[PDB]
Amino acid sequence: FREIKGYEYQLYVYASDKLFRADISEDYKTRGRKLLRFNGPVPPPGGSGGEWEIIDIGPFTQNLGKFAVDEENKIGQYGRLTFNKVIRPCMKKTIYEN
Amino acid sequence: FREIKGYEYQLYVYASDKLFRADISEDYKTRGRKLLRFNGPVPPPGGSGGEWEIIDIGPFTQNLGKFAVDEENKIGQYGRLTFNKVIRPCMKKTIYEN
């Protein structure tokens, strides 16, 4: 916990006049960067703090993991994957209407 | 801010015995789900809290946005995009070595 492994940056980015969410990893030692997420268009953030909480890892959460693996298998970036389980911590963010 | 637009779930998921980070959106009204991120393998989370902070939107952050758009243009999910700007809030997470 003394040695840094890397960073993750989460951005709201306007491109072609539409708003996207993008996540970027940056390795500490090599400075190498990777795009992890780029989705939208998304609503602009409110001037107040987002609402987020850790949720349990019961059946609903396990099912989100199954969904994620099923959707990733349609993409194929990592070959054919077999879902094992979701572990703690799981986070839920609630996005409110303007 | 009274009406919910949807939720976002952030998971650590084991698939084929490797650990990935996955993010899922869930629309409130339709319950429709989308995979937004699935990357790894990633280190397992520590038993303590992750370290995260909001950072300014100066040149370094603008450059992360340019990177994100350049990388998304190599994917093409949204056509050819033109970077405009990164807006607040931008978040930085530090991932420490085990």
From Swiss-Prot, chains A, B:
Keywords: Taste-modifying protein. This is Monellin chain B. Heterodimer of an A chain and a B chain. Gene3D superfamilies: 6.10.140.2000. Disulfide bonds: none annotated. The keyword Transmembrane helix does not apply. Taste-modifying protein; intensely sweet-tasting protein. It comes from Dioscoreophyllum cumminsii. Signal peptide: none annotated. SUPFAM superfamilies: Cystatin/monellin. The record marks C90 as: Blocking, abolishes the sweet taste. The lineage of its organism: Eukaryota, Viridiplantae, Streptophyta, Embryophyta, Tracheophyta. Natural monellin has not been mass marketed to the food industry, primarily due to the challenge of large-scale purification of the protein which is relatively sensitive to heat or acid treatment.
